[PDB]
Amino acid sequence: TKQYERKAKGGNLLSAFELYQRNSGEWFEMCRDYIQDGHVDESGIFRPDNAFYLRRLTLKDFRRFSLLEIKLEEDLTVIIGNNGKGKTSILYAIAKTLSWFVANILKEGGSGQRLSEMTDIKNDAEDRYSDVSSTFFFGKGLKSVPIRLSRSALGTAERRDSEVKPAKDLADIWRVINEVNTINLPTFALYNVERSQPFNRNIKDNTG
Amino acid sequence: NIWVEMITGSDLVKVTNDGHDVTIDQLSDGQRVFLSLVADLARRMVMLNPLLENPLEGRGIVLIDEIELHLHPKWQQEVILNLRSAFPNIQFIITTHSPIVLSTIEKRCIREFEPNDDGDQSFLDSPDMQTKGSENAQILEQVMNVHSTPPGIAESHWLGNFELLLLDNSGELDNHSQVLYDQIKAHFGIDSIELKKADSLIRINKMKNKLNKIR
Amino acid sequence: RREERFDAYSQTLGGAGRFDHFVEWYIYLHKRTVSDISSSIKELEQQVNDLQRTVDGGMVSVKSLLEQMKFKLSEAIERNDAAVSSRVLTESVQKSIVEKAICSVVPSISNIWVEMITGSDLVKVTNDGHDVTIDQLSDGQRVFLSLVADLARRMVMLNPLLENPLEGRGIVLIDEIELHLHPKWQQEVILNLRSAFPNIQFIITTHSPIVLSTIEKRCI
Amino acid sequence: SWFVANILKEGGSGQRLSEMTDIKNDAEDRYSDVSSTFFFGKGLKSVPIRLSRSALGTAERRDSEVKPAKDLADIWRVINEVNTINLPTFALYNVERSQPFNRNIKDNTGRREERFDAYSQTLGGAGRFDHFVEWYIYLHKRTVSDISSSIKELEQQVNDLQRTVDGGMVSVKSLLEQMKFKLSEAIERNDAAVSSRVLTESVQKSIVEKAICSVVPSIS
Amino acid sequence: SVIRGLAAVLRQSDSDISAFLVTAPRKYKVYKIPKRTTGFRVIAQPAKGLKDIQRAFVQLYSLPVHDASMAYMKGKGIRDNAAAHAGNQYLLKADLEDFFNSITPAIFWRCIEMSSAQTPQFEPQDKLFIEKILFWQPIKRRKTKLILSVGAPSSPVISNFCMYEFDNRIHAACKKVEITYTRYADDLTFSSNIPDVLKAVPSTLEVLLKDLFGSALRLNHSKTVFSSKAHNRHVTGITINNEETLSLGRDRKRFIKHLINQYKYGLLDNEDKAYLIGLLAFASHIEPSFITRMNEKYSLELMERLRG
RNA sequence: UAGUCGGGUGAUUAGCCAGACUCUAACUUAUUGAACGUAUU
């Protein structure tokens, strides 16, 4: 469409991708260059032109938090406090959100993880639901990728829906472009205290 | 160093750890757990970034809970620097209880809970003190809200009590102040910072009193 | 099996404790406190007496039931006698001792109790002023709770003749005492443990200067 | 597996193809399909089903198409719920069927008597010969016993217990209520058995015995 | 009575109006409109007969609307909305979730009952007809779920009315602490020159929403945004520049210049030309000075030729 | 420093130049309906 063409030519990634999907050259190359372009800085380190990072997180009636907002640094963010201040809760919330990107890079319409109806809703919350809201940034062509994971308490008749379509839309770009011509893909990882385990060389995974 | 041997008839990963060749099973828990983190992350980055000259310069978000887990203080002083140099474009979101780790990080990177929060706080903020390059004892008190000397130990208060006794007796060592002095000497030792402080107090207060008498 | 005295030695030197066994044992203790066996014995004695009267009245069909109930009564008396014979602390007292130990040693925990919620028994805790389940506790709080709970259970089981069973003898080995603890807790942990378990020999490992600031150089 | 799952439960799931082992290694399209067409009389000449699986990371996902199988299985399930019908048998016997016999046989909890136990591990490859032996012994016990004698005996016991409660022994009211519940359950099971239009245990036993002796030459 | 009024306006019989209204909540066409990035919005438009009735209803019955309400108001719009905040350095934006579809007959009648300003009084017999005029039934099977549809001509008026009391209260509260407040449909804007006063507004909003609507209307917490002169500030698609003036924004201006340059060399197709003309009219409304500058840059002759 | 605002230049959504701003802190959106601007009448 002419509207998508204008936005795409202005540097919008989602519009460029939409045009690629409807006409299935130019638009493919726009998408692929958006993901692959970058330069080597003065220190000899490669830097992507379009960075990917979590900008902001909001927690509503989640575990101990009634309503909490956190702004994250692009490089390093360190959370500190006494035991039971919710530091591990914060990383759990983020990991579940990232699971939606991973699921959709692996499979079209893949399902990520969910908030627990047994444990994750704040015990004395008057509304009986929780929300975890995240915004991601992917360069100036995609400044905002909003996701919300939601869950209503066990028993409650009204059920609160998650909103994950933006995660799926972005992950689709990575998956589809990669299938046509290989691109570098983002790494998502959680290392919690469960990483301290006894080692066993004898146990081998025969699964994939 | 790290390498694979097959000559015994089973595939074994070996490492040179502190100058000694050992199996992974022989590593301490602290070393193994940290090795596991880095190995896993490096593997994933290599597999996901085939087109980069240095695949460890790929993009991504990595979450680490309790980065100081099983680490000696010496290692706590290196861990964040090493990670950031090896993975320069990853966004790291980490949690810590270590002032030693905080001494290596800028204040802008730190997010701190208010001390008596109760889960209604709306926005998290950075500490007022610059942590990067600061002394650990200052970070304890100014950022982590902990006394640098344990308040529940009586001996921790002896110097304060000693000073008060000295000031009660116009700066002269009385019987009571001498007893406490001897207790400090006996407990902390002849070369202790605490005894030096006590000695200093004696010297200063004696001189102050002499000045007062001249006046 | 969790009520047997020598269950206290089960997997004692395996490295994890058995916090699962504690929870089972604690719920058990709660159920027995809410219903004592003697009233059950008295009730069973009354049922046996009523059934015996029915059999004496010519109803031979209930003789099988009488024999079963007499067996149950004998078993209840034996358990009561064995409990009596073991000179063991009452279940109420055992429960109280352990609760006090936990609350004294674990700073964030002010209370612990068993609720019947919906179908099944659940252990609840007052943690930082709020009522939560064990699975809601932070890893640091849970790990430390687990240590103390396990140790207190074993001491109660092994020291039935002491007024305070936590004043019993033993040797306890703890690797990385500061595991998951904030500096504030590191300043209290050794004092709390030694106060709760005064006659135990503790052999411990640490990386923490804060822990060391509370200990004499002779112990290091 | 898709028919069996849906006869047992609304929205039942059968088995899926493996991404690791079921997809051909050099498949250009990077997905696998297993397509089947079933026949069910002239009214339903074609019941198509497709099981599909794509490789990880493909641009498009290949999903299974199972709705026609589910629709047919739903008819069997729903019609059977209202009024008993005869149901289809599905079974796989692999080379695994050659395995030694456990002489020790398990105590009858009473899963083996339930009609839809006939679908238990039916496509696993070995049969369940152990389940046969349990079921066959069960049938024997029921044939040698009378059915409703337990009800008659239970009816007599409830009548005796009712007389005791009417005679002023209020302590046995709890036991009466338990026995009345047992009686009601027995009647309901009898009625459900009556309602389910199932063959008598004697007849079932005879049919199986004849079949075994007819097919297996050495067994008379 | 409502029926008689409508029949008179529409020059129809009472009977034919009444008959039409029986299944009016189902007389909607549902279609999709593309979003600007990816995806679609779902729209429900009433049938022509129903639209006429809805318009007649709105004409016959004046409902109160607060002055802070900027959307769907005669002689107002996005320019006025943005201008209200242009002099203030600190800005807050908030949004309501599923605004139109959250408004039910229950909410509507509650608002009528509560209203501080003078509302039309309706006979109980007319209430059922009013519900059938104003509310859409999305689910055929579920006769009990009636909601406002954005696509209906009456929905703007009803939605503004339902927010009347809300606007009254919050406007008054904001004025006491020197905060400017406006609402454009579901988009709430707050601005001030005083530091650290806008932080309290979201909490105030949540309480007020709960008080007036219970759990029916809620803030979209994901869409609550603070800004200042340190950062980009816009209000309803209009940029507020650091000289406290309304602007199209640099990117849009540069795009328009691009299109004019293309036109200068005869490279614009007719569709793009039409687009350019339309956008220049908007530019003339928001930023007339920009048009003057373009005349200077491109020759008045060229621009006049273009606007012919 | 960074981010932001944007006057100019530039076959022009880029790039470049000039000037400025900084509450912990914008992410540019939606029609055929409604309103506003322009055109037509």
Ligand SMILES: Nc1ncnc2c1ncn2[C@@H]1O[C@H](COP(=O)(O)OP(=O)(O)O)[C@@H](O)[C@H]1O
């Ligand atoms: N659903 C809940 N409702 C209320 N409080 C909760 C809930 N879940 C957990 N908590 C509390 O939140 C804290 C959990 O801490 P956690 O997230 O593990 O933080 P940290 O890692 O800082 O110790 C404890 O104080 C626990 O009691």
Ligand SMILES: [Mg+2]
């Ligand atoms: Mg239009």
